[PDB]
Design a protein around this ligand. Structure first.
Ligand SMILES: O=C(O)c1ccnc(C(=O)O)c1
Ligand SMILES: [Br-]
Ligand SMILES: [Mn+2]
Lengths: 429, 18
Protein backbone atom coordinates (compact mmCIF):
# COMPACT_ATOMS: atom_id res chain seq x y z
CA UNK A 1 0.00 0.00 0.00
CA UNK A 2 2.63 2.59 1.03
CA UNK A 3 5.15 3.35 -1.71
CA UNK A 4 8.51 3.99 -0.03
CA UNK A 5 10.85 3.62 -3.03
CA UNK A 6 11.87 6.53 -5.24
CA UNK A 7 13.17 6.02 -8.78
CA UNK A 8 16.71 5.07 -7.75
CA UNK A 9 15.72 2.91 -4.77
CA UNK A 10 13.75 0.75 -7.20
CA UNK A 11 17.01 -0.09 -8.99
CA UNK A 12 18.53 -1.42 -5.74
CA UNK A 13 15.38 -3.06 -4.40
CA UNK A 14 17.07 -6.47 -4.15
CA UNK A 15 19.75 -5.18 -1.78
CA UNK A 16 17.18 -3.20 0.22
CA UNK A 17 14.88 -6.22 0.45
CA UNK A 18 17.73 -8.52 1.48
CA UNK A 19 18.59 -6.19 4.36
CA UNK A 20 14.97 -5.67 5.41
CA UNK A 21 14.35 -9.42 5.56
CA UNK A 22 17.18 -9.77 8.09
CA UNK A 23 15.58 -7.16 10.35
CA UNK A 24 12.16 -8.82 10.18
CA UNK A 25 13.70 -12.11 11.38
CA UNK A 26 15.04 -10.28 14.44
CA UNK A 27 18.66 -10.56 13.29
CA UNK A 28 19.03 -6.91 14.31
CA UNK A 29 22.83 -6.92 14.55
CA UNK A 30 23.20 -8.26 11.00
CA UNK A 31 20.50 -5.94 9.66
CA UNK A 32 22.10 -2.82 11.16
CA UNK A 33 25.42 -3.61 9.49
CA UNK A 34 23.70 -4.38 6.18
CA UNK A 35 21.87 -1.05 6.07
CA UNK A 36 24.99 0.81 7.18
CA UNK A 37 26.68 -0.84 4.20
CA UNK A 38 23.83 0.37 1.97
CA UNK A 39 24.06 3.88 3.42
CA UNK A 40 27.78 4.20 2.65
CA UNK A 41 27.25 2.81 -0.86
CA UNK A 42 24.04 4.78 -1.54
CA UNK A 43 24.33 7.84 0.74
CA UNK A 44 21.29 9.48 -0.91
CA UNK A 45 18.95 6.47 -0.63
CA UNK A 46 15.93 7.31 1.56
CA UNK A 47 14.98 3.65 1.98
CA UNK A 48 18.51 2.67 2.99
CA UNK A 49 18.50 5.43 5.61
CA UNK A 50 15.03 4.46 6.85
CA UNK A 51 16.18 0.86 7.26
CA UNK A 52 19.16 1.99 9.33
CA UNK A 53 16.76 3.97 11.52
CA UNK A 54 14.26 1.12 11.92
CA UNK A 55 17.12 -1.24 12.81
CA UNK A 56 18.44 1.20 15.41
CA UNK A 57 14.87 1.49 16.71
CA UNK A 58 14.47 -2.29 17.06
CA UNK A 59 17.93 -2.45 18.64
CA UNK A 60 16.81 -0.06 21.38
CA UNK A 61 13.89 -2.40 22.09
CA UNK A 62 16.12 -5.47 22.37
CA UNK A 63 18.77 -3.55 24.33
CA UNK A 64 16.25 -1.41 26.27
CA UNK A 65 18.66 1.51 25.76
CA UNK A 66 17.69 5.17 25.51
CA UNK A 67 20.95 6.10 23.77
CA UNK A 68 20.35 3.57 21.00
CA UNK A 69 16.89 5.04 20.46
CA UNK A 70 18.30 8.58 20.52
CA UNK A 71 20.56 7.59 17.63
CA UNK A 72 17.59 6.24 15.69
CA UNK A 73 15.84 9.59 16.25
CA UNK A 74 18.61 11.42 14.40
CA UNK A 75 18.59 8.85 11.59
CA UNK A 76 14.83 9.31 11.16
CA UNK A 77 15.62 13.00 10.75
CA UNK A 78 18.36 12.17 8.25
CA UNK A 79 15.78 10.44 6.03
CA UNK A 80 13.80 13.69 5.74
CA UNK A 81 16.93 15.65 4.77
CA UNK A 82 17.68 13.42 1.76
CA UNK A 83 16.58 14.31 -1.78
CA UNK A 84 13.53 12.94 -3.56
CA UNK A 85 12.01 11.26 -0.51
CA UNK A 86 8.62 9.63 -1.24
CA UNK A 87 5.76 11.23 0.66
CA UNK A 88 4.69 8.04 2.45
CA UNK A 89 8.26 7.38 3.61
CA UNK A 90 8.72 11.01 4.66
CA UNK A 91 5.60 10.88 6.84
CA UNK A 92 6.42 7.46 8.34
CA UNK A 93 9.95 8.56 9.22
CA UNK A 94 9.06 11.84 10.94
CA UNK A 95 5.99 10.44 12.71
CA UNK A 96 8.04 7.60 14.20
CA UNK A 97 10.62 10.23 15.19
CA UNK A 98 7.98 12.20 17.09
CA UNK A 99 6.49 9.10 18.72
CA UNK A 100 9.94 8.02 19.91
CA UNK A 101 10.76 11.55 21.09
CA UNK A 102 7.63 11.54 23.26
CA UNK A 103 8.44 8.01 24.47
CA UNK A 104 11.80 9.30 25.73
CA UNK A 105 10.21 12.40 27.27
CA UNK A 106 11.53 14.86 24.66
CA UNK A 107 8.24 16.70 24.32
CA UNK A 108 9.70 20.01 23.14
CA UNK A 109 11.58 18.23 20.36
CA UNK A 110 8.52 16.21 19.39
CA UNK A 111 6.63 19.47 18.85
CA UNK A 112 9.08 20.80 16.26
CA UNK A 113 8.79 17.53 14.34
CA UNK A 114 4.99 17.70 14.53
CA UNK A 115 4.95 21.32 13.34
CA UNK A 116 7.18 20.30 10.44
CA UNK A 117 4.88 17.37 9.63
CA UNK A 118 1.86 19.69 9.43
CA UNK A 119 3.77 22.13 7.22
CA UNK A 120 4.80 19.32 4.87
CA UNK A 121 1.31 17.76 4.81
CA UNK A 122 -1.24 20.59 5.20
CA UNK A 123 -4.29 18.45 4.31
CA UNK A 124 -3.60 15.57 6.74
CA UNK A 125 -6.11 15.98 9.57
CA UNK A 126 -4.60 13.23 11.74
CA UNK A 127 -1.27 15.08 11.86
CA UNK A 128 -2.99 18.21 13.17
CA UNK A 129 -4.63 16.11 15.88
CA UNK A 130 -1.16 14.74 16.68
CA UNK A 131 0.17 18.30 16.81
CA UNK A 132 -2.52 19.21 19.33
CA UNK A 133 -1.36 16.34 21.54
CA UNK A 134 2.17 17.68 21.20
CA UNK A 135 0.98 20.99 22.64
CA UNK A 136 -0.99 19.33 25.45
CA UNK A 137 2.09 17.41 26.60
CA UNK A 138 4.16 20.57 27.18
CA UNK A 139 1.25 22.32 28.90
CA UNK A 140 0.36 24.68 26.03
CA UNK A 141 -3.42 24.49 26.17
CA UNK A 142 -3.87 27.76 24.26
CA UNK A 143 -2.09 26.47 21.15
CA UNK A 144 -3.68 23.02 21.49
CA UNK A 145 -7.10 24.69 21.48
CA UNK A 146 -6.44 26.53 18.21
CA UNK A 147 -5.23 23.33 16.53
CA UNK A 148 -8.42 21.45 17.37
CA UNK A 149 -10.50 24.49 16.43
CA UNK A 150 -8.77 24.48 13.04
CA UNK A 151 -9.48 20.76 12.65
CA UNK A 152 -13.15 21.07 13.63
CA UNK A 153 -13.81 23.87 11.13
CA UNK A 154 -12.56 21.62 8.31
CA UNK A 155 -13.84 18.34 9.81
CA UNK A 156 -16.68 19.01 12.28
CA UNK A 157 -17.31 15.28 12.82
CA UNK A 158 -13.77 14.30 13.88
CA UNK A 159 -14.27 12.57 17.23
CA UNK A 160 -10.62 12.74 18.26
CA UNK A 161 -10.63 16.52 17.89
CA UNK A 162 -13.91 16.65 19.81
CA UNK A 163 -12.84 14.83 22.99
CA UNK A 164 -9.63 16.87 23.06
CA UNK A 165 -11.47 20.13 22.47
CA UNK A 166 -13.90 19.14 25.22
CA UNK A 167 -11.01 18.21 27.52
CA UNK A 168 -9.42 21.63 26.94
CA UNK A 169 -12.71 23.43 27.56
CA UNK A 170 -13.28 21.61 30.84
CA UNK A 171 -9.74 22.39 32.01
CA UNK A 172 -10.64 26.04 31.31
CA UNK A 173 -13.68 25.66 33.63
CA UNK A 174 -16.06 25.91 30.65
CA UNK A 175 -18.04 23.03 32.09
CA UNK A 176 -21.32 23.33 30.19
CA UNK A 177 -19.54 23.93 26.87
CA UNK A 178 -17.26 20.89 27.28
CA UNK A 179 -20.07 18.36 27.76
CA UNK A 180 -21.34 18.08 24.14
CA UNK A 181 -17.78 17.79 22.81
CA UNK A 182 -16.71 15.13 25.32
CA UNK A 183 -19.97 13.20 24.85
CA UNK A 184 -20.10 13.36 21.04
CA UNK A 185 -16.40 12.57 20.84
CA UNK A 186 -16.68 9.40 22.93
CA UNK A 187 -19.85 8.37 21.10
CA UNK A 188 -18.01 8.79 17.79
CA UNK A 189 -15.95 5.67 18.48
CA UNK A 190 -13.05 7.07 16.47
CA UNK A 191 -9.56 5.79 17.33
CA UNK A 192 -8.32 7.58 20.44
CA UNK A 193 -11.72 8.53 21.87
CA UNK A 194 -11.96 5.44 24.13
CA UNK A 195 -9.77 6.96 26.84
CA UNK A 196 -10.45 6.99 30.58
CA UNK A 197 -9.61 10.70 30.76
CA UNK A 198 -12.64 11.66 28.67
CA UNK A 199 -14.96 9.37 30.63
CA UNK A 200 -13.58 10.77 33.89
CA UNK A 201 -13.99 14.41 32.87
CA UNK A 202 -17.34 14.04 31.09
CA UNK A 203 -18.90 12.60 34.25
CA UNK A 204 -17.29 15.27 36.42
CA UNK A 205 -18.58 18.07 34.19
CA UNK A 206 -22.07 16.56 34.38
CA UNK A 207 -21.98 16.37 38.19
CA UNK A 208 -21.05 20.05 38.38
CA UNK A 209 -24.07 21.09 36.29
CA UNK A 210 -26.53 18.81 38.10
CA UNK A 211 -26.93 16.36 35.21
CA UNK A 212 -27.97 12.98 36.62
CA UNK A 213 -26.55 11.16 33.56
CA UNK A 214 -22.99 11.44 34.90
CA UNK A 215 -22.86 8.04 36.60
CA UNK A 216 -24.00 6.32 33.40
CA UNK A 217 -20.69 7.43 31.90
CA UNK A 218 -18.82 6.26 35.00
CA UNK A 219 -20.48 2.85 34.59
CA UNK A 220 -19.54 2.76 30.90
CA UNK A 221 -15.95 3.73 31.67
CA UNK A 222 -15.85 0.97 34.27
CA UNK A 223 -17.39 -1.40 31.70
CA UNK A 224 -14.59 -0.58 29.23
CA UNK A 225 -11.81 -1.16 31.76
CA UNK A 226 -10.80 2.45 32.42
CA UNK A 227 -12.07 2.58 36.02
CA UNK A 228 -11.53 -0.08 38.66
CA UNK A 229 -15.09 0.67 39.80
CA UNK A 230 -17.79 3.31 39.52
CA UNK A 231 -16.61 4.91 42.78
CA UNK A 232 -12.84 4.45 42.30
CA UNK A 233 -11.93 6.32 39.11
CA UNK A 234 -8.17 6.91 39.33
CA UNK A 235 -6.29 6.40 36.06
CA UNK A 236 -2.67 5.73 37.16
CA UNK A 237 -3.23 2.44 38.96
CA UNK A 238 -1.41 -0.70 40.05
CA UNK A 239 -4.05 -3.40 39.63
CA UNK A 240 -4.87 -5.68 42.55
CA UNK A 241 -4.28 -3.21 45.39
CA UNK A 242 -6.88 -3.52 48.14
CA UNK A 243 -9.57 -0.92 47.45
CA UNK A 244 -11.79 0.50 50.19
CA UNK A 245 -12.85 4.11 50.90
CA UNK A 246 -11.89 4.28 54.59
CA UNK A 247 -8.94 2.68 56.40
CA UNK A 248 -8.07 2.16 60.04
CA UNK A 249 -4.50 2.65 61.30
CA UNK A 250 -4.24 -1.11 61.89
CA UNK A 251 -5.38 -1.90 58.35
CA UNK A 252 -2.68 0.36 56.88
CA UNK A 253 0.08 -1.07 59.08
CA UNK A 254 1.51 2.44 59.57
CA UNK A 255 0.71 2.47 63.30
CA UNK A 256 3.98 4.14 64.30
CA UNK A 257 3.40 7.05 61.90
CA UNK A 258 -0.15 7.50 63.20
CA UNK A 259 1.02 7.37 66.82
CA UNK A 260 3.67 10.00 66.11
CA UNK A 261 1.14 12.31 64.44
CA UNK A 262 -1.42 11.98 67.22
CA UNK A 263 1.07 12.17 70.10
CA UNK A 264 2.78 15.30 68.70
CA UNK A 265 -0.26 16.91 67.07
CA UNK A 266 -0.01 20.12 69.12
CA UNK A 267 3.46 21.04 67.83
CA UNK A 268 2.27 20.30 64.29
CA UNK A 269 -0.68 22.61 64.89
CA UNK A 270 1.42 25.37 66.43
CA UNK A 271 3.95 25.50 63.59
CA UNK A 272 1.08 25.70 61.11
CA UNK A 273 -0.51 28.54 63.09
CA UNK A 274 2.83 30.37 63.24
CA UNK A 275 3.04 30.23 59.45
CA UNK A 276 -0.55 31.47 59.20
CA UNK A 277 0.28 34.44 61.43
CA UNK A 278 3.76 35.43 60.25
CA UNK A 279 4.27 33.77 56.85
CA UNK A 280 0.82 33.40 55.30
CA UNK A 281 2.25 33.63 51.78
CA UNK A 282 3.55 30.08 52.24
CA UNK A 283 -0.09 28.96 52.03
CA UNK A 284 -1.02 28.76 48.33
CA UNK A 285 -4.62 28.59 47.02
CA UNK A 286 -5.79 25.28 45.63
CA UNK A 287 -5.22 25.58 41.88
CA UNK A 288 -6.94 22.50 40.41
CA UNK A 289 -10.45 23.97 39.93
CA UNK A 290 -11.82 21.65 42.62
CA UNK A 291 -13.89 24.29 44.47
CA UNK A 292 -17.45 25.29 43.75
CA UNK A 293 -16.91 28.20 46.16
CA UNK A 294 -14.95 29.31 49.21
CA UNK A 295 -11.34 29.70 50.27
CA UNK A 296 -8.91 26.78 50.42
CA UNK A 297 -5.12 27.03 50.70
CA UNK A 298 -2.27 24.60 51.32
CA UNK A 299 1.25 24.81 52.77
CA UNK A 300 3.30 21.99 51.25
CA UNK A 301 6.35 20.45 52.94
CA UNK A 302 6.87 17.42 50.65
CA UNK A 303 5.81 16.74 47.08
CA UNK A 304 6.75 13.84 44.80
CA UNK A 305 8.98 12.54 47.58
CA UNK A 306 11.05 15.75 47.59
CA UNK A 307 11.44 17.93 50.66
CA UNK A 308 10.87 21.67 50.17
CA UNK A 309 13.77 23.13 52.14
CA UNK A 310 12.39 26.67 52.29
CA UNK A 311 8.93 25.47 53.32
CA UNK A 312 10.39 23.41 56.16
CA UNK A 313 11.89 26.60 57.63
CA UNK A 314 8.32 27.35 58.71
CA UNK A 315 7.71 23.93 60.30
CA UNK A 316 11.18 22.69 61.28
CA UNK A 317 10.13 20.41 64.15
CA UNK A 318 7.35 18.89 62.04
CA UNK A 319 9.74 18.20 59.16
CA UNK A 320 12.24 16.67 61.59
CA UNK A 321 9.49 14.48 63.07
CA UNK A 322 8.46 13.23 59.61
CA UNK A 323 12.01 12.41 58.45
CA UNK A 324 11.68 9.21 60.52
CA UNK A 325 8.93 7.82 58.24
CA UNK A 326 10.07 7.08 54.66
CA UNK A 327 6.65 5.61 53.89
CA UNK A 328 5.42 9.22 53.54
CA UNK A 329 8.54 11.30 52.83
CA UNK A 330 9.41 8.84 50.06
CA UNK A 331 5.89 8.71 48.60
CA UNK A 332 6.61 10.10 45.13
CA UNK A 333 2.85 9.93 44.38
CA UNK A 334 1.77 11.98 47.39
CA UNK A 335 2.48 15.09 49.43
CA UNK A 336 2.77 16.34 52.99
CA UNK A 337 1.02 19.63 53.61
CA UNK A 338 -1.11 21.77 55.87
CA UNK A 339 -4.57 22.49 54.47
CA UNK A 340 -6.68 25.44 55.65
CA UNK A 341 -10.32 25.78 54.60
CA UNK A 342 -12.65 28.61 55.56
CA UNK A 343 -16.45 28.81 55.91
CA UNK A 344 -18.55 28.99 52.77
CA UNK A 345 -16.40 26.41 50.97
CA UNK A 346 -17.59 23.42 48.97
CA UNK A 347 -15.20 21.11 47.13
CA UNK A 348 -16.72 19.37 44.10
CA UNK A 349 -16.86 15.57 44.17
CA UNK A 350 -13.51 14.45 42.79
CA UNK A 351 -11.04 11.59 42.57
CA UNK A 352 -7.26 11.56 42.92
CA UNK A 353 -4.97 10.46 40.10
CA UNK A 354 -3.60 7.21 41.52
CA UNK A 355 -4.63 4.25 43.66
CA UNK A 356 -1.02 3.91 44.85
CA UNK A 357 -1.42 6.16 47.91
CA UNK A 358 -3.51 6.52 51.04
CA UNK A 359 -4.36 9.87 52.60
CA UNK A 360 -3.95 10.65 56.31
CA UNK A 361 -5.77 13.68 57.74
CA UNK A 362 -4.67 14.91 61.18
CA UNK A 363 -7.08 17.38 62.77
CA UNK A 364 -5.35 20.50 64.08
CA UNK A 365 -8.07 23.18 64.38
CA UNK A 366 -11.53 21.69 63.87
CA UNK A 367 -14.62 23.84 64.57
CA UNK A 368 -17.40 22.10 66.47
CA UNK A 369 -19.79 22.01 63.51
CA UNK A 370 -19.81 22.71 59.78
CA UNK A 371 -16.86 20.59 58.57
CA UNK A 372 -17.29 17.16 57.02
CA UNK A 373 -15.79 14.94 54.33
CA UNK A 374 -17.57 12.26 52.29
CA UNK A 375 -15.66 9.41 50.66
CA UNK A 376 -17.78 7.03 48.59
CA UNK A 377 -21.17 6.91 50.39
CA UNK A 378 -19.87 7.55 53.92
CA UNK A 379 -19.45 10.97 55.55
CA UNK A 380 -17.09 11.60 58.46
CA UNK A 381 -15.70 14.50 60.48
CA UNK A 382 -12.23 15.45 61.66
CA UNK A 383 -11.13 15.58 65.29
CA UNK A 384 -8.34 17.65 66.80
CA UNK A 385 -5.39 15.35 67.44
CA UNK A 386 -6.91 12.41 65.54
CA UNK A 387 -6.05 10.86 62.18
CA UNK A 388 -8.51 9.96 59.44
CA UNK A 389 -7.37 7.67 56.61
CA UNK A 390 -9.09 7.27 53.25
CA UNK A 391 -8.28 6.23 49.68
CA UNK A 392 -8.71 9.43 47.66
CA UNK A 393 -8.88 7.42 44.43
CA UNK A 394 -12.50 6.99 45.53
CA UNK A 395 -14.83 9.90 44.86
CA UNK A 396 -14.84 12.26 47.82
CA UNK A 397 -16.41 15.59 48.71
CA UNK A 398 -15.80 18.24 51.38
CA UNK A 399 -17.86 21.03 52.95
CA UNK A 400 -16.92 23.90 55.28
CA UNK A 401 -19.95 25.62 56.85
CA UNK A 402 -18.51 26.53 60.27
CA UNK A 403 -17.93 30.04 61.65
CA UNK A 404 -14.10 29.99 61.65
CA UNK A 405 -11.19 28.34 59.88
CA UNK A 406 -10.48 24.60 59.77
CA UNK A 407 -6.84 23.48 59.70
CA UNK A 408 -5.70 19.91 59.02
CA UNK A 409 -2.39 18.18 58.28
CA UNK A 410 -2.31 15.86 55.26
CA UNK A 411 0.23 13.01 55.09
CA UNK A 412 0.28 10.71 52.06
CA UNK A 413 1.68 7.18 52.32
CA UNK A 414 2.39 4.47 49.77
CA UNK A 415 -0.38 1.92 49.51
CA UNK A 416 0.75 -0.68 52.09
CA UNK A 417 0.59 -3.60 49.64
CA UNK A 418 3.05 -1.92 47.25
CA UNK A 419 6.39 -3.71 47.23
CA UNK A 420 9.72 -1.93 47.82
CA UNK A 421 10.67 -2.33 44.15
CA UNK A 422 7.33 -0.80 43.14
CA UNK A 423 7.84 2.14 45.50
CA UNK A 424 11.23 2.81 43.90
CA UNK A 425 10.21 2.36 40.25
CA UNK A 426 6.73 3.86 39.91
CA UNK A 427 6.90 7.22 38.08
CA UNK A 428 6.21 10.21 40.29
CA UNK A 429 2.84 11.98 40.34
CA UNK B 1 1.23 21.59 36.19
CA UNK B 2 1.02 18.56 38.48
CA UNK B 3 -1.82 16.26 39.53
CA UNK B 4 -1.93 16.64 43.32
CA UNK B 5 -5.61 16.23 44.25
CA UNK B 6 -7.23 15.71 40.84
CA UNK B 7 -6.73 14.66 37.21
CA UNK B 8 -6.82 18.07 35.54
CA UNK B 9 -3.67 17.68 33.45
CA UNK B 10 -3.62 15.78 30.17
CA UNK B 11 -0.82 13.60 31.56
CA UNK B 12 0.09 13.35 35.24
CA UNK B 13 3.38 11.47 34.77
CA UNK B 14 6.54 12.83 33.16
CA UNK B 15 8.24 9.61 32.04
CA UNK B 16 11.61 9.49 30.30
CA UNK B 17 13.15 6.34 28.84
CA UNK B 18 12.58 2.62 29.17
O1 LIG C 1 -8.08 19.76 52.88
C1 LIG C 1 -9.22 19.36 52.53
O2 LIG C 1 -10.25 19.77 53.13
C2 LIG C 1 -9.37 18.38 51.37
C3 LIG C 1 -10.38 18.51 50.49
C4 LIG C 1 -10.51 17.62 49.44
N1 LIG C 1 -9.63 16.61 49.30
C5 LIG C 1 -8.61 16.47 50.18
C6 LIG C 1 -7.60 15.34 50.03
O3 LIG C 1 -6.77 15.11 50.94
O4 LIG C 1 -7.61 14.62 48.99
C7 LIG C 1 -8.47 17.37 51.23
BR1 LIG D 1 9.45 32.48 52.06
MN1 LIG E 1 -9.03 15.27 47.44
Amino acid sequence: KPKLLNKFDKTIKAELDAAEKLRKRGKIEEAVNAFKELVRKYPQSPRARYGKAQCEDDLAEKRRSNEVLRGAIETYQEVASLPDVPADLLKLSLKRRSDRQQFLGHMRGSLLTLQRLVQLFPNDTSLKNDLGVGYLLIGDNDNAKKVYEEVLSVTPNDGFAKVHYGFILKAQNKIAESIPYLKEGIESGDPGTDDGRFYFHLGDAMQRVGNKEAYKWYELGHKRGHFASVWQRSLYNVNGLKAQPWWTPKETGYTELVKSLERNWKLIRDEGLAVMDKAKGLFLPEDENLREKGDWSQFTLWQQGRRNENACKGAPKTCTLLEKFPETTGCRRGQIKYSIMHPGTHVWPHTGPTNCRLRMHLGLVIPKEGCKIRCANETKTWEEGKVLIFDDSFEHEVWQDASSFRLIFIVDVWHPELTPQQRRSLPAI
Amino acid sequence: GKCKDGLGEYTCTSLEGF
